[PDB]
Structures are given as C-alpha cells and as structure tokens.
Design a protein around this motif. Structure first.
Motif, mmCIF file in Angstrom:
data_model
loop_
_atom_site.group_PDB
_atom_site.id
_atom_site.type_symbol
_atom_site.label_atom_id
_atom_site.label_comp_id
_atom_site.label_asym_id
_atom_site.label_seq_id
_atom_site.Cartn_x
_atom_site.Cartn_y
_atom_site.Cartn_z
ATOM 1 N N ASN A 323 0.827 -1.206 0.000
ATOM 2 C CA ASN A 323 0.000 0.000 0.000
ATOM 3 C C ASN A 323 0.864 1.260 0.000
ATOM 4 O O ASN A 323 0.620 2.218 0.736
ATOM 5 C CB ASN A 323 -0.971 -0.006 1.183
ATOM 6 N N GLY A 372 -2.435 -7.066 -4.733
ATOM 7 C CA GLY A 372 -1.535 -6.446 -3.782
ATOM 8 C C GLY A 372 -1.563 -7.062 -2.400
ATOM 9 O O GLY A 372 -2.511 -6.863 -1.635
ATOM 10 N N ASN B 76 1.974 2.735 -9.052
ATOM 11 C CA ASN B 76 2.071 1.351 -9.502
ATOM 12 C C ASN B 76 0.901 0.586 -8.886
ATOM 13 O O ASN B 76 1.036 -0.047 -7.837
ATOM 14 C CB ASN B 76 3.414 0.747 -9.108
ATOM 15 N N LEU B 77 -0.249 0.643 -9.556
ATOM 16 C CA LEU B 77 -1.461 -0.018 -9.098
ATOM 17 C C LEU B 77 -2.081 -0.772 -10.269
ATOM 18 O O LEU B 77 -2.257 -0.193 -11.355
ATOM 19 C CB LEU B 77 -2.464 0.993 -8.529
ATOM 20 N N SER B 96 -8.810 -0.295 -8.229
ATOM 21 C CA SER B 96 -7.618 -1.082 -7.964
ATOM 22 C C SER B 96 -7.767 -1.753 -6.608
ATOM 23 O O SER B 96 -8.636 -1.394 -5.811
ATOM 24 C CB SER B 96 -6.351 -0.219 -7.993
ATOM 25 N N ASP B 98 -5.677 -1.578 -4.110
ATOM 26 C CA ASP B 98 -5.405 -0.565 -3.096
ATOM 27 C C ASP B 98 -6.569 0.412 -2.965
ATOM 28 O O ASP B 98 -6.947 0.788 -1.850
ATOM 29 C CB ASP B 98 -4.109 0.173 -3.425
ATOM 30 N N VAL B 110 -4.610 8.670 -5.622
ATOM 31 C CA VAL B 110 -5.561 7.693 -5.086
ATOM 32 C C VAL B 110 -6.558 8.487 -4.249
ATOM 33 O O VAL B 110 -6.272 8.902 -3.126
ATOM 34 C CB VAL B 110 -4.869 6.602 -4.275
ATOM 35 N N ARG B 118 -8.173 0.834 3.353
ATOM 36 C CA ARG B 118 -7.825 -0.330 2.547
ATOM 37 C C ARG B 118 -8.816 -1.461 2.795
ATOM 38 O O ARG B 118 -9.273 -2.131 1.857
ATOM 39 C CB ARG B 118 -6.395 -0.754 2.893
#
Lengths: 518, 173
Positions: A323, A372, B76-77, B96, B98, B110, B118
C-alpha cells in the motif's frame, strides 16, 4: 490537568521523547493507523512452503512459487507471449511455459550469411559458410535456421544451403547488432518505451528494444563505481551505484544521457531496493532515500537519526512494498549479545511521515502486483501480511512521555471503543476456534500426550500506565471509567496500550469531575 | 476508444494496436505497441493515453500513431475491473486493489486513500465494481456478501469537487 489521547499517530525516533508531537508516540508496533484509532494488524496465514533452504529472493509466476539462493530480479518481457526473465542466477535464463531456457542464443546457429560476387552467374562454387551472423530467437530458437545472401554489401536463385537443420531463405536487412547476453549481468528491470536494463560489474547494458534476448555491445553504458541495482521512475532510470547515484534519461537505448542527481549517497543493499511506485528507495549509510520525479529526499533525516540508522543496519535490510509503504526487515545484534528483530514500515503519505513498527522478521519479500499483498519468507514458509480471515494480532502503542507542568496523579481512565461487531473478525475468530478444536482432536488421540490442548484466543483491552518509568497499573475495563493506583506522584507520565481490538481514545484526569470537564 | 488527433486504440491480450489515423478499418501491424503485463482497458486524458495493465500502468504520449512513446506513471497499481474504468472527463478512474485512483493531466492520485480505508475497499470489492459518470461523479455499484450470509448491495458515488472529497451512498443496485 487532563491529558487526552485521540487521533493517534506513528513513531518518530529522531526526536526527544518529551518533544514528540501531541499525538505521536513510541513503539507503534503491529498497529494500522488509518481512521485515527488503534486498529490491530491481522495475523499472517501460511499460504505455501518453499523447497530450497536459505532463499534470499522469492517470486510467484502463474500459480507456482519460485525461489532462488541468489538475489534474482525478474520482470515480464515486452514480447506478446507470457515470458519471465530472471537473471540473478548467474547465467541469464528464461522461463517459457514453466520450462527454463537460457536467455543467450548461441551464435552461428539460427542465422548465417553467405555472399559472393560470382553467385547468380555460375552454378555450384560456394564455400559453405562465409560469415556467421548473430542468431535470432524470435518465438522458436535452435529449431529453425535463416540464410541471407548479402551480395554487393533480395530475390534471386536460392542456390545451395546448409542441411544441418530446417532453413529459410529470407533476404532482409540482417540484424547483426544482436549479441548474446554476457555472463555476470545481475539486475533486470522493465522500462517504459520497451526494453530491458542490466548491469555488469561496472557497465550497464541495454537490450534491443522489442527483442529481450539481444544485448548489443554498442548500447552499453559505462558508469563510475560499481552498480548495485536499478530502478525506474518515469522514462528516466535511477542508476544506483556504490558512489554517486546517476539518472539515465532517454527515449531510446541509443539516445541515453546519464545525469548526476541532487544527492550523493551510495547504495549499500541491493535487496533493500524497492520500486514503491511513486519513487525508488534504496537504503544508504546516511539513511533511506527515494528517487522520484519531484526530486531526491532522505525521508529518515526527517524522522530517524544517523545513529539509529547505523544501529538498524542498512547492509542487510530486506525491503518490501505494501500500500505504498516501504517494509524494512531488520535483524541486528546490539553489543553484549542481544538480538533485535522486527519490521520497520515507512509511510510518507500524510501530514508528517512516521515509522510503524512490526515484529515479523522476513528473510525475503515479494509484492504480488496483480493482487496487492506482501509475501514474506520466515522459517521456510510463505506468509501474507494482514491477510483477510485471520484473528487480529496484539497491538503495541506506547504514548509520548507526557511531562506535566506540575507533578500530579491521575484518577480516571476512559477506554472507549467497541468489541468484535464487524462479524468478519468474528468469522475469523470462529475459523480459529475450528482450527483449535481440530488440533485438540488430533492431539487428544495421541498414543497419551502430556500438556497440549492449547487455550483458545480472546478479545481484550490492556492499558498500562508508566508513572516515571514504573508500571503502576494495568486496566482492562472498557467504556467505563477506571481508577489508577495512589501514593505515587510523578510528572513524566506515559501510556502503553495493548489490545486485540480497536480503541477509540484514552483520556486521563485526577478526578471524575475533571473528566466531566473534558 | 477514440483519440484526439483522430485514430482508434485497441489492445490484444498483451499488445496494443493503433489504427490508421482517419481510416478506421485499417489496423497496421507496424502501428502496434507491445506492453508488459496484460492490458485491461484504455483511457485518454489530453493527447496521452492511459494503458491500464495488470501490472504497472503506462502512459503513451503521441502526436501520431508512429510517434508513440509509452511512459511510466507515478503510481504502480493494477487495474482489477475493466468495467470500473470510466472517463470522468477530468481523469480516468479505474478501481484497484489498493483503491480507486484517477489518472489526469495534473497528476496521479488515489482519491480513496484520503477518504476510505484499505479494508473498506477490499470489502466493497474492486473485482466487480460497475462504474458510471454523472455530473463528473464516479458512480460505483457494489454487490458483495458479508461472511455468515449477509449481502450488501448499493451505489457508492465519489465526488472530489469541493473543499474535501466525500462518499455519497445510494441503494440502487
């Protein structure tokens, strides 16, 4: 004389404990600070096990897990078909359909050029092989062959050809600039315009743009000092060296211009390099520093000391990203033989950056980009980070040393919060209970077995108050005012909070009537 | 998708294809660009394209199909949902893992990291987010099942215009 703890923040060790911000605190261990409370981290779950002992780099391709004994960098290739190029294992090698090949294509195998002035006028003659051009892997290599006639250097008599293998008579501009990947190339990263970057002991190599296997010698770039690792931000590369870091700017491998960067800090650990997405961060002796589009900034100089960064040890920092946070695993021996092991998470997003500590040592890190979630190797197994479906882990949070203007003793604690009511934590706890019952059943049938029958878990709140460096009380009553001990007068007060559940805030007063005031 | 100077952008499993500028049916092979990772969807702000990939998002800047230069982006997602992509007019927002992130000329940000956790984004579920635009607002429709058999269905509207962005919820699946 109320002290109220709300909107908790992380740890900043480059500050005297009394001079920390009002809501900054020491030892923020296993805590996720997102909403403004003490949300506990989840416990890692064992996903899969590694084959070969002492793995220093772990990777996942398709469903299988890959690990190697060397620092290995792997990136997908620009070619259309799914390919994996991992080169840290000495000779550059390539995986196709789960089968490992060598990135180098032997010369004088796929392509051969024969030319003569007497050709196309007299039959026979010829000399078998005149010049051996560089081979081209394309999609199939060491299976087909290509032959070209470079007369006076396209359509004419095919003439005789070598019969060693299947051959094709194609007459196009020969790509002789291709070169076999030399041995010793270590670090491979992907680039914007489509190309591969790799470095020898001191020279960096550039591949053919859309042909991964070709590594032409004229594309190579030589830098001062050794080269540790490579990172890319935007179109420009970060050439991380044992000396001065260099930024290579270029739209194409031919049009490459390295540039000095605004900071002169060596790269100590190759593994500590992580592409955080917004920057590339490499541990240094001075401190952790990331290269980004905006500029070069040493984050730790703001939030960590030179002494602490030396004591942590930049040589063997295991790096990871979750993250947009740099996960650093440190294991160092302080003098007289005590071992400190833990994970240092660096988050720069927010009003002020801070360190969130954790106590899960990681031999290697892997951030599966598609989904992720960090995978870290500990004890020869693969564990995720705070994966869904696991019981919350115990949280450590030790408040800033509150130096009250006058020495007082406190007589109220209000520990607000709620028990397990999300029902996802409850479902995870139920699954843990099922595992506990299963292990109870399997150990209960042992031919018998002394002890075992481990106790199930529970949700608790445990706030410990340190008077002047001495623990006076541990309070567990929640949402209702609690009472301290008496007979002790201290002025340097601090609070440590331990719980498996989230806690809203902590407020202290010497009397309940003062707790009424605020 | 359509492009400014006049052209169309298409992607194969891993390669993007560029059509003839003013001739739609033509899809030259020399115009194609190959990117790392799979390609999920395509969005455009200004002249530059957003190549939304399972790995690192790529920005292709070009005045012409021949003059194409893909560029790394500041985040970078991965792009989980193809349908969640909506051309909001001022940015290209794709869900995404994230969180929802918008690609625009000013930068790459974001939005949800400011306003949502999250955990909440994972529980909402970026895999099957239905995306839409109304008055420059990203309409996200989520239908996910809480463990133990509880089902949540609703619409999450994201508005960034204002002093601070916030979520306006709705209950129309």
């Amino acid at each position: 004389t109320t002290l109220k703890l709300t909107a908790y923040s992380g740890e900043v060790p480059r500050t005297l404990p009394r001079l920390l911000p009002d809501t900054a605190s020491q030892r923020a261990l296993n805590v996720r600070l997102d909403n403004g409370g003490l949300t506990p981290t989840r416990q890692p779950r064992f996903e899969a096990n590694i084959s070969v002992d002492n793995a220093k780099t772990i990777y996942k391709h398709n469903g299988a897990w890959l690990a190697w004994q060397n620092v290995v960098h792997a990136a997908p290739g620009p070619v259309a078909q799914d390919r994996l190029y991992y080169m840290g294992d000495g000779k550059p090698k390539m995986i196709v359909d789960g089968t490992t090949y060598d990135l180098a294509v032997p010369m004088p195998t796929a392509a051969p050029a024969l030319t003569v002035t007497g050709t196309g006028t007299g039959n026979v003659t010829s000399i078998a092989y005149v010049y051996t051009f560089v081979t081209a892997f394309g999609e199939e290599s060491e299976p087909s062959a290509l032959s070209n006639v470079a007369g006076w250097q396209a359509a004419s008599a095919a003439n005789f050809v070598d019969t060693h293998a299947t051959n094709d008579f194609g007459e196009m501009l020969p790509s002789l600039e291709y070169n076999a990947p030399p041995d010793g190339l270590k670090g491979l990263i992907s680039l914007p315009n489509g190309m591969m970057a790799a470095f020898t002991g001191k020279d960096l190599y550039f591949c053919e743009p859309f042909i991964p296997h070709a590594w032409p010698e004229k594309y190579i770039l030589t830098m001062d000092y050794q080269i540790v690792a490579l990172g890319a931000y935007g179109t420009t590369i970060v050439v991380m060296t044992e000396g001065l870091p260099y930024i290579v700017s270029g739209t194409a491998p031919e049009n490459m211009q390295q540039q000095r960067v605004e900071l002169n800090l060596p790269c100590i650990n190759a593994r500590g390099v992580i592409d955080l997405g917004y920057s590339v961060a490499y541990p240094s002796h001075d401190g952790l520093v990331m290269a980004g589009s905006n500029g070069m900034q040493v984050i730790t100089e703001q939030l960590m000391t030179r002494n602490d960064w030396m004591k942590t040890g930049p040589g063997n920092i295991v790096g990871g990203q979750f993250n947009g946070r740099y996960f650093a695993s440190y294991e160092y021996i302080e003098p007289s033989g005590a071992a400190f092991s833990g994970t240092l998470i660096f988050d720069t997003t927010g009003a002020a950056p801070f360190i969130i500590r954790s106590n899960h040592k990681a031999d290697a890190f892997f951030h599966e980009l598609q989904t992720g979630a960090l995978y870290f190797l500990v004890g020869k197994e693969i564990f995720e980070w705070d994966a869904l479906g696991q019981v919350n882990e115990t949280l450590s949070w030790r408040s800033k040393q509150f130096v009250l203007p006058m020495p007082t003793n406190f007589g109220a604690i209000l520990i607000e919060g709620s028990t397990a009511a999300s029902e996802e934590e409850q479902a995870a706890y139920d699954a843990e209970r099922q595992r506990i019952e299963v292990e109870n059943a399997t150990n209960f049938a042992l031919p018998n077995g002394d002890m075992m029958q481990r106790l199930p878990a529970e949700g608790f709140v445990s706030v410990s108050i340190y008077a002047d460096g001495k623990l006076v009380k541990t309070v567990s009553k929640m949402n209702r005012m609690a009472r301290l001990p008496s007979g002790f007068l201290a002025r340097i007060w601090e609070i440590e909070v331990n719980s498996n559940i989230n806690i809203s805030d902590i407020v202290l007063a010497t009397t309940g009537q003062e707790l009424r005031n605020v």
